[PDB]
Amino acid sequence: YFPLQSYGFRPTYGVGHQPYRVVVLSFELLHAPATVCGPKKSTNLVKN
Amino acid sequence: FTNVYADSFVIKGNEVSQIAPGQTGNIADYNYKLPDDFTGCVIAWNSN
Can you say where in the cell this protein is located (chain B) (predicted)? Predict the structure, then answer.
């Protein structure tokens, strides 16, 4: 048998068979360096 | 599973796509609803 099965989505199927678009955002928070994220306003650095 | 409840019927080679969860049309509405979310294993074997 062919390993893939297509599924023909139709407007008349119920909610269990209707198509859904999904986005999964995968990220680690505890990795020490970071190059992205943080919608925060910075302040000065007191240094003591 | 507690009971298999295996089924038996013969179709012609136009209803193979009709014996499927959630589909509509004369065939499979008049006869076998085959309701969606059923756990199933439909085997189609050429009997010509």
Answer: Host cell membrane; Host endoplasmic reticulum-Golgi intermediate compartment membrane; Virion membrane
Which of B23, B38, B42 is the mutation pick for testing A, counting most A CBs within 10 A?
Answer: B23
Q: Say how far apart CA A30 and CA A47 lie, in whole Å.
A: 25
Is A9 exposed, middle or buried, given 0-12, 13-18 or 19+ CB atoms closer than 10 A?
A: exposed
Q: How far apart are the C-alpha atoms of B44 and B6, rounded to whole Å?
A: 13
Task: State the method.
Answer: cryo-EM
How many angstroms is the resolution? 2.9
Those residues with Cβ within 8 angstroms of residue B42's Cβ, 6 or more apart along the chain or in another chain: B19, B20
Within 10 angstroms of residue B2's Cβ, the number of other Cβ atoms is 4
Q: What are B29's two structure tokens?
A: 């509405």
